Coordinates of C-alpha atoms in Angstrom, one line a residue:
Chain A
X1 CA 63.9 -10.9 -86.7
X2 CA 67.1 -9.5 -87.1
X3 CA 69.4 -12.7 -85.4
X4 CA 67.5 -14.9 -87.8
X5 CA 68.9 -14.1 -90.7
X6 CA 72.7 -14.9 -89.6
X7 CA 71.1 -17.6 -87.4
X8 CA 72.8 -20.8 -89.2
X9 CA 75.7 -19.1 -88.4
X10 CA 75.5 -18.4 -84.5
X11 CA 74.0 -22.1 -84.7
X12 CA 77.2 -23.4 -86.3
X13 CA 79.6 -21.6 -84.7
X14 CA 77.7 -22.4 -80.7
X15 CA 77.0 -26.1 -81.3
X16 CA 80.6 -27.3 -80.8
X17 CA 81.4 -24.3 -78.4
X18 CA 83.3 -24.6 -74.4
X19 CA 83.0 -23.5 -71.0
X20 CA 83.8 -24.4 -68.0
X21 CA 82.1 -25.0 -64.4
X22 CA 70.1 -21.5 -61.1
X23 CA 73.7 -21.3 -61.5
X24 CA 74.4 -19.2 -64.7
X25 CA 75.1 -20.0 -68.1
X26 CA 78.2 -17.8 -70.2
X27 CA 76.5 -19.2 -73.3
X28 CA 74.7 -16.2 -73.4
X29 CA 77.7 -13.8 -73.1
X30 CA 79.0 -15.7 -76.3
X31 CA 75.7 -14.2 -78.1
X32 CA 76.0 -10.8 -77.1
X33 CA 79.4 -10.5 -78.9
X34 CA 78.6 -12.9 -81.9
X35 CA 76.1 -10.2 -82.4
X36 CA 78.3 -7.4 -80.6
X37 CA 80.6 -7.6 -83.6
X38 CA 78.9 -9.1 -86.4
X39 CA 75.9 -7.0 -85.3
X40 CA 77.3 -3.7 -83.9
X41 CA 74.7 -1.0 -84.0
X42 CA 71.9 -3.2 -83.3
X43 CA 72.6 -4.9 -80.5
X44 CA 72.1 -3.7 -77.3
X45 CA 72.2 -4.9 -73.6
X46 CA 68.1 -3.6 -72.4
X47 CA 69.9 -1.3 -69.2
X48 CA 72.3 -0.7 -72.1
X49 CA 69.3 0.4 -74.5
X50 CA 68.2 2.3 -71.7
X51 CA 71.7 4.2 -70.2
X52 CA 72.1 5.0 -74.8
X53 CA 68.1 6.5 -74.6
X54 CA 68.5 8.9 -72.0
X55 CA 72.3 10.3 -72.7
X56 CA 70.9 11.1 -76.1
X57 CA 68.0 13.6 -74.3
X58 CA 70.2 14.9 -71.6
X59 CA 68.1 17.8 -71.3
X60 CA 65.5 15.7 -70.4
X61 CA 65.1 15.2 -66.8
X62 CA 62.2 13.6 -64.6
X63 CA 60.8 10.4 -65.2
X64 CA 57.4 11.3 -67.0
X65 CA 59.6 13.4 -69.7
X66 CA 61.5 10.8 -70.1
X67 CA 59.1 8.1 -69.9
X68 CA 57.7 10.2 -73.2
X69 CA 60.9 9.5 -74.6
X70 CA 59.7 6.0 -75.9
X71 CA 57.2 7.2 -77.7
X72 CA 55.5 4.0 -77.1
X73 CA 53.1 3.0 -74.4
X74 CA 53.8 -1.0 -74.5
X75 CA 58.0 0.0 -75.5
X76 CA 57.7 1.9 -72.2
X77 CA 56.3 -1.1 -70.6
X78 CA 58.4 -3.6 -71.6
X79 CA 61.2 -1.9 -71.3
X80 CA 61.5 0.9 -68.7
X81 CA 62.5 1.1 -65.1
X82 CA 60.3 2.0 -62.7
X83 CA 59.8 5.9 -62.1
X84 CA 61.6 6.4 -59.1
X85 CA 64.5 4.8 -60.6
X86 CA 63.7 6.6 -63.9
X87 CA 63.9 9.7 -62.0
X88 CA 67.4 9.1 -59.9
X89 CA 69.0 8.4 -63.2
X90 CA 71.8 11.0 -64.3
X91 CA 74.3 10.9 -66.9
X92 CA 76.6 9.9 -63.9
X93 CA 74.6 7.9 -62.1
X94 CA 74.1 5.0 -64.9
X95 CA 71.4 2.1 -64.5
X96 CA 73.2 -1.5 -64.5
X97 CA 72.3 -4.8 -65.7
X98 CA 69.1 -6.2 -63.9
X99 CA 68.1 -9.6 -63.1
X100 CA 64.3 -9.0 -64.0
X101 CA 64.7 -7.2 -67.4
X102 CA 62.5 -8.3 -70.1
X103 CA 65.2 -9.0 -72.5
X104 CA 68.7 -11.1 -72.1
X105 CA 69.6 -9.2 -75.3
X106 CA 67.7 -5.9 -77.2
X107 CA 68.2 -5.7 -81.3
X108 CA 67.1 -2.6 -82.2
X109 CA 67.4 -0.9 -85.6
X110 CA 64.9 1.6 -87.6
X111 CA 62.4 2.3 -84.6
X112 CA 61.9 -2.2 -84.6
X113 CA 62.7 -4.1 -81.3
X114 CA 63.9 -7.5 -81.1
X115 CA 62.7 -8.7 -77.6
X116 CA 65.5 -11.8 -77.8
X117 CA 66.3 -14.4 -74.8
X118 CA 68.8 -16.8 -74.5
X119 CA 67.6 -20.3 -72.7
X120 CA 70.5 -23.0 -71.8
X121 CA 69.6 -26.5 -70.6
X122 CA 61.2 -29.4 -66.6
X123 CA 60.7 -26.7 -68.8
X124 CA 62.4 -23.0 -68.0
X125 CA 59.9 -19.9 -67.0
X126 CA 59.8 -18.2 -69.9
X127 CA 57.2 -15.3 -69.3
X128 CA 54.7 -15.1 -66.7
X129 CA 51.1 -14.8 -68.5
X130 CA 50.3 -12.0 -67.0
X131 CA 53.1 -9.7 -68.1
X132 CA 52.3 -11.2 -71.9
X133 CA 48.7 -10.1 -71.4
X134 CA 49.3 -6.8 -70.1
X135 CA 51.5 -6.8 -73.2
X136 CA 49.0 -7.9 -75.4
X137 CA 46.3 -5.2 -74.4
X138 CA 48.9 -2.5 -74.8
X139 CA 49.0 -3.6 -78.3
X140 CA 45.7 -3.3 -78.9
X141 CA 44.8 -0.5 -76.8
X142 CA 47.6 1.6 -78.5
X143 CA 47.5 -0.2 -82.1
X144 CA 51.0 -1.3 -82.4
X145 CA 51.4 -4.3 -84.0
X146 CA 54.7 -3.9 -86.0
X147 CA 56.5 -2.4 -83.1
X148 CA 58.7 -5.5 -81.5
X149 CA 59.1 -9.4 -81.4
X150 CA 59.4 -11.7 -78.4
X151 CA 62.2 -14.5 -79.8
X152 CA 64.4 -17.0 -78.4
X153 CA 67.5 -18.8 -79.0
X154 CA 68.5 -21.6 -77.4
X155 CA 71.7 -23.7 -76.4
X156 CA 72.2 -27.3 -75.6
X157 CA 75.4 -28.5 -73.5
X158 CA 76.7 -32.1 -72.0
X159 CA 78.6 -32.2 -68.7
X160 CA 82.5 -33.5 -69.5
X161 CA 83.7 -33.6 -66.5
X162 CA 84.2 -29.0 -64.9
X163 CA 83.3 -28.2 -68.5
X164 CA 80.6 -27.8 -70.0
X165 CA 80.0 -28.4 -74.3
X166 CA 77.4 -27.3 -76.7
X167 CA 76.1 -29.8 -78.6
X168 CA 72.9 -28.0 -80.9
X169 CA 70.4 -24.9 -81.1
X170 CA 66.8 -23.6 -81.4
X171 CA 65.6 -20.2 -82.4
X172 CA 61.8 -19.5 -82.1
X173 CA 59.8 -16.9 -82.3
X174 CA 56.6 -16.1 -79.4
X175 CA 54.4 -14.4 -81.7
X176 CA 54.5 -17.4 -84.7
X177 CA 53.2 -20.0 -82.2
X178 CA 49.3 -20.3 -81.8
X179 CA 48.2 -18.4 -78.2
X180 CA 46.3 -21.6 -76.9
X181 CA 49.4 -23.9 -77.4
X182 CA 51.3 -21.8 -74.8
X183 CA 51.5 -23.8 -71.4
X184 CA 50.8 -21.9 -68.3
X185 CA 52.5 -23.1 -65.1
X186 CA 49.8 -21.2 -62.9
X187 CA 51.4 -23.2 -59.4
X188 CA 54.6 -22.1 -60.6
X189 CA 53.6 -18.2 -60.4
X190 CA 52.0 -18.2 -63.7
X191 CA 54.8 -18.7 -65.6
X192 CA 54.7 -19.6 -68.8
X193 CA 57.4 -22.7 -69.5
X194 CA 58.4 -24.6 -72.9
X195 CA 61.8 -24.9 -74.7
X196 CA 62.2 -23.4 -77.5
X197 CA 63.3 -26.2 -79.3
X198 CA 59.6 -27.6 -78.7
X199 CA 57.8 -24.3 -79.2
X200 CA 55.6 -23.9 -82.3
X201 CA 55.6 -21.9 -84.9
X202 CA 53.1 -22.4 -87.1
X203 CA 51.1 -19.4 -86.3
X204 CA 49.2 -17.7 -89.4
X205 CA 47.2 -14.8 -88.5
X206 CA 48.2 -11.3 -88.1
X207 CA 50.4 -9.5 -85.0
X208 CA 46.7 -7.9 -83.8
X209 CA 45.0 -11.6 -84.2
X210 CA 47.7 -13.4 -82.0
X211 CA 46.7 -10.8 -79.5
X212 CA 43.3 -11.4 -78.9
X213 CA 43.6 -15.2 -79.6
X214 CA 46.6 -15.1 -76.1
X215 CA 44.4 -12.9 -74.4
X216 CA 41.2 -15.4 -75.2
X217 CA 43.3 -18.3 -74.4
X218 CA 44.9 -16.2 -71.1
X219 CA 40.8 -15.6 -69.5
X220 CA 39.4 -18.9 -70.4
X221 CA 42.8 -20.5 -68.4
X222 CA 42.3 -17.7 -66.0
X223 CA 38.8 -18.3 -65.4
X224 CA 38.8 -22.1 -65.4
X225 CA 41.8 -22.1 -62.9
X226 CA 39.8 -19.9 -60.6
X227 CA 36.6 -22.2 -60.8
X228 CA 38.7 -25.2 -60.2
X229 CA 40.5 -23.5 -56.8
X230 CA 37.2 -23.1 -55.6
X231 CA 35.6 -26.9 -56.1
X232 CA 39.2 -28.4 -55.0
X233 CA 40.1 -26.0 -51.7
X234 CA 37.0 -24.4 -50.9
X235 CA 33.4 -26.4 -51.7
X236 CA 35.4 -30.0 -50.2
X237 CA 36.2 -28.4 -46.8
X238 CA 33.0 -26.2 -46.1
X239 CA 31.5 -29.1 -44.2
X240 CA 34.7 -29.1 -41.8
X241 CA 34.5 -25.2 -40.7
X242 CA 30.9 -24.0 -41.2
Chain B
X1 CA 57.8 -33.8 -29.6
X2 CA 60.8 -36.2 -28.9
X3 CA 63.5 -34.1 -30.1
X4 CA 63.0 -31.3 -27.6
X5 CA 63.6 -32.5 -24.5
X6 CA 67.3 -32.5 -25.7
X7 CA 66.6 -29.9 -28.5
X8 CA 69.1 -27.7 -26.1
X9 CA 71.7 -30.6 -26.5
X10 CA 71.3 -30.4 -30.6
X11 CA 71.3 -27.1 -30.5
X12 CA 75.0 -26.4 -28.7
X13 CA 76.3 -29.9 -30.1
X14 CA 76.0 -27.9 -33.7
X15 CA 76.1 -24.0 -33.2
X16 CA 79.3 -24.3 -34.0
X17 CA 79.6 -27.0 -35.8
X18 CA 81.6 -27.6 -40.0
X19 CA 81.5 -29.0 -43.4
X20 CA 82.9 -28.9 -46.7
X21 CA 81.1 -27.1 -50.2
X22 CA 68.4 -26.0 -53.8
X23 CA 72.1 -27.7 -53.2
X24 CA 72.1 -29.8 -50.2
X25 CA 72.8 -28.9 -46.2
X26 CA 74.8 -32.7 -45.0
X27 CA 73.9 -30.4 -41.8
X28 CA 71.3 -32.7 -41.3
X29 CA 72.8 -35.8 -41.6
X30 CA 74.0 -34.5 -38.4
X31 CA 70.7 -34.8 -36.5
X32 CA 69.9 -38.3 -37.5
X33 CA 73.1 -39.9 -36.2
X34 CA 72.5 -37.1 -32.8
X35 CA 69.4 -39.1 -32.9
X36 CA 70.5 -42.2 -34.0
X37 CA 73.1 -42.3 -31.5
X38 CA 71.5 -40.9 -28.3
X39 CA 68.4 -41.7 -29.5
X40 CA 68.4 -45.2 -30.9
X41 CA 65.1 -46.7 -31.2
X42 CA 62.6 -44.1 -31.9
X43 CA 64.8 -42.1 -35.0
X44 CA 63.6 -43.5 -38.5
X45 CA 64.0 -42.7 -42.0
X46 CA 60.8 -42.2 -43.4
X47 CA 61.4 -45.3 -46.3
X48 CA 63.3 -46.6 -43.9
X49 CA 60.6 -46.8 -41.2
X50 CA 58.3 -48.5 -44.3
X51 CA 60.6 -51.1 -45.0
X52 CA 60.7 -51.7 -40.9
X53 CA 56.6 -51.9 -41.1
X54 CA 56.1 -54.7 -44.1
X55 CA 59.3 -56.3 -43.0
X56 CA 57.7 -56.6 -39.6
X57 CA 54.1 -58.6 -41.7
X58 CA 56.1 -60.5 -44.7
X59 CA 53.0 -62.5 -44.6
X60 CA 51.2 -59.7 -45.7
X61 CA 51.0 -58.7 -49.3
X62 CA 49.5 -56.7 -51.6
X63 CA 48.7 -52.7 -51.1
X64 CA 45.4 -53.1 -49.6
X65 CA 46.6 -56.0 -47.0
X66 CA 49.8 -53.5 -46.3
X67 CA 48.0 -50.4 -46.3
X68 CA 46.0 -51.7 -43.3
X69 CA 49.1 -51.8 -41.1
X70 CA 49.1 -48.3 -40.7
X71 CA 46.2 -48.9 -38.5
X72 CA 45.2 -45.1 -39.4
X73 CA 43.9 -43.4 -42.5
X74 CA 46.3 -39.7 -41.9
X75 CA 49.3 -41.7 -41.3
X76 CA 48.9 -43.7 -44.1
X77 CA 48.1 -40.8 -45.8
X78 CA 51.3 -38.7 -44.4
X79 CA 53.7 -41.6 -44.9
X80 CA 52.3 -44.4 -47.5
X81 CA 54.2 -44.6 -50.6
X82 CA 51.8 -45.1 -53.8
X83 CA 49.8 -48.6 -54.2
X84 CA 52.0 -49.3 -57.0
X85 CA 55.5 -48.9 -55.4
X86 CA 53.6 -50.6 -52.0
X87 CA 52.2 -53.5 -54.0
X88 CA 55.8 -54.0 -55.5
X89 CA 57.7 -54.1 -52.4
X90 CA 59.2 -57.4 -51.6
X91 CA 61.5 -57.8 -48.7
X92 CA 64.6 -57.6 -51.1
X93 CA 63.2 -55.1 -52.6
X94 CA 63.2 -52.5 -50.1
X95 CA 61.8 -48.7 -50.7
X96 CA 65.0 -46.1 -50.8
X97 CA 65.5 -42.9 -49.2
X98 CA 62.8 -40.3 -51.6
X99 CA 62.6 -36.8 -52.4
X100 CA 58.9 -35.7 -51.8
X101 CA 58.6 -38.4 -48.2
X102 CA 56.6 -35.9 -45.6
X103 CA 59.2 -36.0 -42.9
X104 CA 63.2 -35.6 -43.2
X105 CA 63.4 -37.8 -40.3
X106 CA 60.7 -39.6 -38.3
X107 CA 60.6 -40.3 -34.4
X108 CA 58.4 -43.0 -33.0
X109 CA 57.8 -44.3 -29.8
X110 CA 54.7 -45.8 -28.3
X111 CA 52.0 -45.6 -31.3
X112 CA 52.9 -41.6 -31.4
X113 CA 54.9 -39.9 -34.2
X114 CA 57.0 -37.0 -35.0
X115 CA 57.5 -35.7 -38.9
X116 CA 60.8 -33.9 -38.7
X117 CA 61.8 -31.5 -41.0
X118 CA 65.3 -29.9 -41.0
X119 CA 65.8 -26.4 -42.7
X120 CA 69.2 -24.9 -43.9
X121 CA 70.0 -21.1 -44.8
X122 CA 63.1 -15.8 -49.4
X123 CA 61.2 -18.4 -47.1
X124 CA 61.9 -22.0 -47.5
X125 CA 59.0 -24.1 -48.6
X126 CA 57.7 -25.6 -45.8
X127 CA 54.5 -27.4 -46.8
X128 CA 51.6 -27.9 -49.8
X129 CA 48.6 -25.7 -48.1
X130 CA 46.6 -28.5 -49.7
X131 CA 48.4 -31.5 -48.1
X132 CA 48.1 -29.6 -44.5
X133 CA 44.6 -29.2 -45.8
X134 CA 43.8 -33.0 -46.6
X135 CA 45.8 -33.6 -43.7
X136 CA 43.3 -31.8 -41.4
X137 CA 40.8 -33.5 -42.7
X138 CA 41.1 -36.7 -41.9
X139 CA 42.4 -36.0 -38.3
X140 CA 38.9 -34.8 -38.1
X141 CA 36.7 -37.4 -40.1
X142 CA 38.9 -39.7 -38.5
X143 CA 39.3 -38.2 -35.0
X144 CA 43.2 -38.7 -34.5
X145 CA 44.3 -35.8 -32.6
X146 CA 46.9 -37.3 -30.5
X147 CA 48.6 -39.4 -33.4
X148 CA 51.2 -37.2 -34.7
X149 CA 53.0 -33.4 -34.6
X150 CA 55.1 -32.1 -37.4
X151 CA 58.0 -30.4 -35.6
X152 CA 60.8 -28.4 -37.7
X153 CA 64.4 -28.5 -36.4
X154 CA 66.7 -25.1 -38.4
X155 CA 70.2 -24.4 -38.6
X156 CA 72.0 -21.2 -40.2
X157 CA 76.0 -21.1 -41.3
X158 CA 77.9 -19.0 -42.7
X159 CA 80.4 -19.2 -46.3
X160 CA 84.3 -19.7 -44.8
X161 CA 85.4 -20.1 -48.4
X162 CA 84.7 -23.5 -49.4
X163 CA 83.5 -24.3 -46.1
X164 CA 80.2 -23.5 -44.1
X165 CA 80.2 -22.7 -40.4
X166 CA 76.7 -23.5 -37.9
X167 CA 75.7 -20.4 -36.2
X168 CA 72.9 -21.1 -34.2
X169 CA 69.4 -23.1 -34.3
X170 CA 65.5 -22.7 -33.7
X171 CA 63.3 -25.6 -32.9
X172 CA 59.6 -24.8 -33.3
X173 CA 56.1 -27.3 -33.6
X174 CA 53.4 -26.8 -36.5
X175 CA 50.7 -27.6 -34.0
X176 CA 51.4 -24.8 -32.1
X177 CA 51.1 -22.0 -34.4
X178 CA 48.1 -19.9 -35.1
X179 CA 46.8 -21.4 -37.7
X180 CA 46.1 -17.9 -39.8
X181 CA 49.4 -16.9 -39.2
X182 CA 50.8 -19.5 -41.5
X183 CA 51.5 -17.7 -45.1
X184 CA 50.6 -19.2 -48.1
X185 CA 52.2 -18.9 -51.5
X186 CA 50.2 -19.2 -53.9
X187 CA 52.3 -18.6 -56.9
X188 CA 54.4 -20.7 -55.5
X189 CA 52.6 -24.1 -55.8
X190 CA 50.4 -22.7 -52.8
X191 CA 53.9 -24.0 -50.6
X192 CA 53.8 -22.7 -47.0
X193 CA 56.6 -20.4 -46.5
X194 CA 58.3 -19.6 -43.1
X195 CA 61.8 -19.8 -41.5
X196 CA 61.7 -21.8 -37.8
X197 CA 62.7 -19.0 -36.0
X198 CA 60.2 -16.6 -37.1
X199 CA 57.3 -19.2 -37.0
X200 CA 54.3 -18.6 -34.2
X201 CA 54.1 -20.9 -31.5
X202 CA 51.3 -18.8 -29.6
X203 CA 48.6 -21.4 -30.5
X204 CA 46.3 -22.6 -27.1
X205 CA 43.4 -24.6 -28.3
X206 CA 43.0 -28.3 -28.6
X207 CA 44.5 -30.1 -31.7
X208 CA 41.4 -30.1 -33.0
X209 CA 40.7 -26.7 -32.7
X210 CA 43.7 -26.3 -34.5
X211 CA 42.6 -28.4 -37.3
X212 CA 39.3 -26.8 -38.0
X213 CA 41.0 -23.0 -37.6
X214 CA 43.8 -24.0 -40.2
X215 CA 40.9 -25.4 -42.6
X216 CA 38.7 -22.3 -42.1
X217 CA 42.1 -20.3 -43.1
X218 CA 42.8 -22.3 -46.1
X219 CA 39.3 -22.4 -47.3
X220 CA 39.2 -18.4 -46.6
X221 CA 42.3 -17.5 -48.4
X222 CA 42.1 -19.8 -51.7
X223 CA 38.6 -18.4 -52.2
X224 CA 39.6 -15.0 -52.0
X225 CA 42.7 -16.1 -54.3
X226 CA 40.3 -17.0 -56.8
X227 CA 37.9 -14.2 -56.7
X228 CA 41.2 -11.9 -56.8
X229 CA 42.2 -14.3 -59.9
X230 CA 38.6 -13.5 -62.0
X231 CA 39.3 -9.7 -61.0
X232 CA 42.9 -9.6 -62.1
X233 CA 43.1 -12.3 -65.0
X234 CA 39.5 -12.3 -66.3
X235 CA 37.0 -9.3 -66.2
X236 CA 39.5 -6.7 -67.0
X237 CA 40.5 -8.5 -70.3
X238 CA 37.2 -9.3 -71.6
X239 CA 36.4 -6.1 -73.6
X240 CA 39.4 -7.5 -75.7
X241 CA 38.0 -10.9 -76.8
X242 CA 33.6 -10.6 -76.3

């Protein structure tokens, strides 16, 4: 992690911070900068990442040449736009920030991602299960296990009034918490939800091993939750419709 | 339903009607007093029409003794707070307006009910595909088809600035929808989704007809949710942890 290392001081210099009046949060715009400055040439905004990628291969037009330009299958899948947007992209024509994008934030720096979000605060969705097992399987289908890091850093405020203050912090890092600890909210569209604050961390084993131990912990929810949809809504009514 | 037979009164009294800045829509405190008003008498508060029941027995006590005074297994099961919160009630310690109560506003009259909903505007959700499926059941192992209707009353505005303008209503009936026409999502808690005006009121057969074709729906769809779940979520992930 790249934010960890100057973490005390975001941490510090947040937990006594101000703002005024979903909804929306500007305690992540105070992040972007804190890094933005401190951490120029590593930070990046993910459309930003992405707008920065393509105006450096301007030659490269078309969305499967510049899908190439990742040079990394699960890179490309956390990151990218979809092709046809891919495609309509031009120099002039600039992508913009986007509501779904994996990342609030992108630290990049010597071909290493930092996959970092930015929680304020019935635990928040923090990544459907899904996406983190397709991302898992591109790992291990393409053997990148030194390529990026999911982490978080979180922000606590207390209402005073139309303002809003910070009061502490969190930072946490996805792949240092064991797979089967992460809570999957499958009612609320498979989202996974903790705070960071309450995350784990104590994860030994390596990148490849946390992999297979989400993806084992991912099918056994999967199939379980499947099973149990069948002997709640289906076996109990049969007798009413056959 | 109660409300319709001066739905058309409702409906121009507050087309155009106003008020100041989920959220909250006081456009429904609107209906209640329209009700309360010109139709004293039948218009409840759910809680409110529970305190009316036990305050009507104060010689009964205890959930079990109260639970009876429902005189029918759905409606206790539509309306009946937990045995807990029943057993505690105590005349001066009346139940208070709740979040999750069935109806926004109930209408009685003459042993027969009327859960009222109001919606105010991505589909609202409407109702648990599971509680609608319970709730079929025991009209049929009960046979009460003529007990009750759940009838949905919406109103749309429009931002003025800090203010919000009524531009027009839809009144539509449950019951007389097509039961496989009502969309379920899944993801989303398996909530019912639909907006009033768009919702089917095509439905001919009896009420119980309609009961046994939403189950056979239900049942249909959450077993073909989990099949799609093992397909999706479990056999194309197991080459990665067998």
């Amino acid at each position: 992690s790249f934010i960890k290392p100057i973490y005390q001081d975001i941490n510090s210099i947040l937990i006594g911070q101000k703002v005024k009046r979903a909804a929306g949060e500007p305690f992540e715009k105070l992040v972007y900068k804190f890094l933005k400055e401190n951490l120029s040439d590593l930070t990046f905004k993910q459309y930003e990442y992405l707008n920065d990628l393509f105006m450096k291969n301007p030659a490269i037009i078309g969305h499967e040449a510049r899908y190439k330009l990742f040079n990394s299958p699960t890179l490309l899948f956390l990151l990218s736009r979809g092709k046809a947007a891919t495609e309509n992209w031009s120099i002039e024509n600039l992508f913009e920030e986007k509501q779904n994008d994996t990342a609030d934030i992108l630290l990049v720096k010597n071909q290493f991602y930092e996959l970092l979000d930015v929680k304020t605060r019935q635990s928040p969705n923090i990544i459907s299960a899904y996406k983190l097992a397709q991302t898992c399987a591109k790992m291990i289908d393409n053997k990148e296990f030194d390529l990026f890091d999911i982490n978080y850093l979180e922000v606590d405020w207390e209402l005073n009034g139309e303002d809003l203050v910070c009061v502490s912090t969190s930072f946490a890092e996805l792949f240092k918490s064991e797979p089967s600890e992460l809570y999957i909210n499958w009612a609320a569209a498979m989202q996974i939800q903790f705070h960071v604050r309450d995350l784990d961390q104590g994860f030994n084993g390596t990148r490849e091993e946390w992999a297979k131990s989400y993806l084992k912990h991912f099918v056994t929810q999967a199939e379980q939750r499947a099973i149990s949809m069948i002997d709640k809504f289906v076996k109990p009514f049969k007798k009413y419709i056959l």
